[PDB]
Amino acid sequence: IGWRREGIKYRRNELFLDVLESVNLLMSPQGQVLSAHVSGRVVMKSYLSGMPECKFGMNDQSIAIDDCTFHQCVRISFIPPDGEFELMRYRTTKDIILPFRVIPLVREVGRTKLEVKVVIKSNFKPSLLAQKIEVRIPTPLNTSGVQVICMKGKAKYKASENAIVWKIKRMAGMKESQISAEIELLPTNDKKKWARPPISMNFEVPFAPSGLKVRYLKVFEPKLNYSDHDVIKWVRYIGRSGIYETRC
C-alpha cells in the first residue's frame, strides 16, 4: 500500500473530521432562489495505529449528493493515510439550508438622492452563531457622498471600491438586523441608467448547509488489540459562503 507505511503506532488513537462546505446562491429581490448549490469536501486528520480499516457513513434529515470525486484509497470503506488528507469532494443542489436572506429596498428620490435599506434575516437554530458576516452594497459610479447608520455592527463606504461594506461580528439564528443608507448622486446622463449589481454576502456558520451529517465512522484493526470503542473521534462542521448574491 503506497499511501500508508506499515508499523504506525499512536498512543491516543484520535480522529479529527472536518466537513467544509461552500453555499452559493443567487436570489431575486422578491426572495426567489434563482440558482443555488453547495460545494463541499471532507478532510480527515487520522492518528490511528497500524493498518486500520475505516467505514464512513452518512445520510445519503436526509440529503442526496449529486457528484462525487473520491481519494485513491476508497472502494464507503478505505485504509486512510497517516495525517491530513482529503477524503472526498461533493456537490448537492436539493434541499439546501440558505443561512441568510438578503432583502433589498431601493427608493429613488428625484435624480439626486438614493435612500436604500437592506435587511438580513438569519435562518438557522438560534443556539448557533454565524460569524464573520460581511454585506457589500454597491453604490452607483456617480456618488458624491453616502450617509449610513446601522444598528448592529459597523459600516463604511469604501468609495474606491464603489460600494458600502457592512461587517457584523456574530449573529444568532432566527434574528434580523438592518442597515439604512442615503446616497447623494452627482448629475449625469440619464441615458445609460445603470446595471444594478447584486448585494453580496460572506459568513461562517457552524453547520453544513446541505444538511449532511456524519452517521458513523467505524475503525477496524484485527491484528492490533484495539477496536472502534477505543478511538477518540471528533467532527467539525464549517460552512463558508462563496457567491451569495441577491438581485436588488
Residue 167 annotated in ligand binding: yes
How is the beta sheet containing 53-58 ordered, strand by strand? 77-78, 53-58, 214-220
Q: Which is nearer to another protein, 45 or 89 (CB)?
A: 45
Q: Which is nearer to another protein, 71 or 233 (CB)?
A: 233
Residue 158 annotated in ligand binding: yes
Q: Which is nearer to another protein, 106 or 128 (CB)?
A: 128
216 residue type, one letter: Y
Minimum separation from the CB atom of position 179 to another protein (A): 31
- Return d(Cα 29, Cα 196) in angstroms, integer: 11
Q: Are 216 and 184 in contact (CB under 8 A)?
A: no
Minimum separation from the CB atom of position 210 to another protein (A): 18
Minimum separation from the CB atom of position 218 to another protein (A): 11
Minimum separation from the CB atom of position 136 to another protein (A): 28
Residue with cell 439564528: 173
Sites of contact with another protein (CB under 8 A): 15-17, 214, 217, 233-236
Residue with cell 448585494: 199
Q: Which is nearer to another protein, 182 or 228 (CB)?
A: 228
If we measure between CA atoms, which residue out of 215, 203, 239 comes closest to residue 19? Answer: 239
Calculate the CA 111 to chain-centre distance.
Answer: 38
Q: Are 97 and 211 in contact (CB under 8 A)?
A: yes
User: What are the DSSP E strand ranges found in the chain?
Assistant: 14-27, 33-47, 53-58, 67-70, 77-78, 83-92, 100-109, 113-122, 129-138, 143-150, 154-158, 163-172, 176-185, 199-205, 214-220, 232-246
Q: Which is nearer to another protein, 16 or 70 (CB)?
A: 16
Minimum separation from the CB atom of position 85 to another protein (A): 18
Q: Which residues are annotated as a binding site?
A: 154, 158, 167
